[PDB]
Amino acid sequence: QITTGSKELDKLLQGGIETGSITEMFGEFRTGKTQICHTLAVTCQLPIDRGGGEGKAMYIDTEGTFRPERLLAVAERYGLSGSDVLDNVAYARAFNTDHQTQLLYQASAMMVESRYALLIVDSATALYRTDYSGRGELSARQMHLARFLRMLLRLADEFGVAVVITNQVVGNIIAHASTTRLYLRKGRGETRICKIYDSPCLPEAEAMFAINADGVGDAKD
Template sequence: MKPANTKEDVVPKVSNSSTLEEVEEEQLYAGPLKIEQLLAKGFVKRDLELLKEGGLQTVECVAYAPMRTLCAIKGISEQKAEKLKKACKELCNSGFCNAIDYHDARQNLIKFTTGSKQLDSLLKGGIETGGITELFGEFRTGKSQLCHTLAITCQLPIEQSGGEGKCLWIDTEGTFRPERIVAIAKRYGLHPTDCLNNIAYAKAYNCDHQTELLIDASAMMADARFALLIV
């Protein structure tokens, strides 16, 4: 996934001599490391293609994947899998860190509003990026409505308590309604067409199809800034 998870991630650090073009060429926010970085570690494009075919789109995905998952990819030997994991762990620094550093990172996590001040207060600021938030309740208690609202608020700028990213929606119950998106976008003074364009939608017809969609989603989130995934 490629949403910026901390407030510091979205603040460009530009020297006086930097041009706008130079800044745009660099990533102004932190996110998953693209798997292409493995090329600098001695791996070839074919290795990257095999990993992507296996649903592993980022350095982190490879670093945290079980060995059996890597070895199950056709064309990846056990020896190659070990080298891949070692290289990826070096790139993403997946070892221990000081608790104070982790505390500082937690303090800078981006949270975007639910659209309700009372609910934001209960959640201590809103929906937290980089984590899982589960909504559950009886039929017709507002779960789908809240998801539609979040699909808009995640697009708002950081300074407006937004996530400043796109939304990816995998519909398992057929509850997505673009008309609601249009209405909520107008409520926040946003252009409905732009908001709809920033939502990637797919309907999952069964568990296997949902798994396939999640693999496709990982590729999309590795290439663009998404702040929210709704399933």
């Protein structure tokens, strides 16, 4: 179980993400999906006794929001070497849906030589909206997304890593494929509300957390 670094969120998840499965967090923009991704990108490298996976991180960005400085802040919060964190995070920006899936081909071969624990795909659904904008081409983007999700599941079962994808809510296919769906909504200021909206094992429940300069971290009224 990879620690989220929010204790309340860890309790909500019973200790953190299950490696080897896809966890989807759907919420409005600015809810902190990207911030949680940046935090996990570092916490994954933490020792297992500290809630990490003792593995490198993979950040596939489609939205430009990748900040190595956020990774440095998370590393210094938990006392990890920021330089080693950036050395254990491989980053690449996907320009389109086809490029987004093509990066998985390099990811599968690269993930064999080194132990990874986390795969991050940020604005995973944005490129299927910007690229495929027509109505007759909807089935094509749905097929590409389906294949992409199957590839995610395959890599998860192959390397035993956690698969994190982010969705902006301004597909029903992900429900059966994703094991845990988390709904994120803004509480005013920088403090966010998290809700579980389906889990066969986890209750439907809510937990409050905040977005702090160091971290994605528990709410401290």
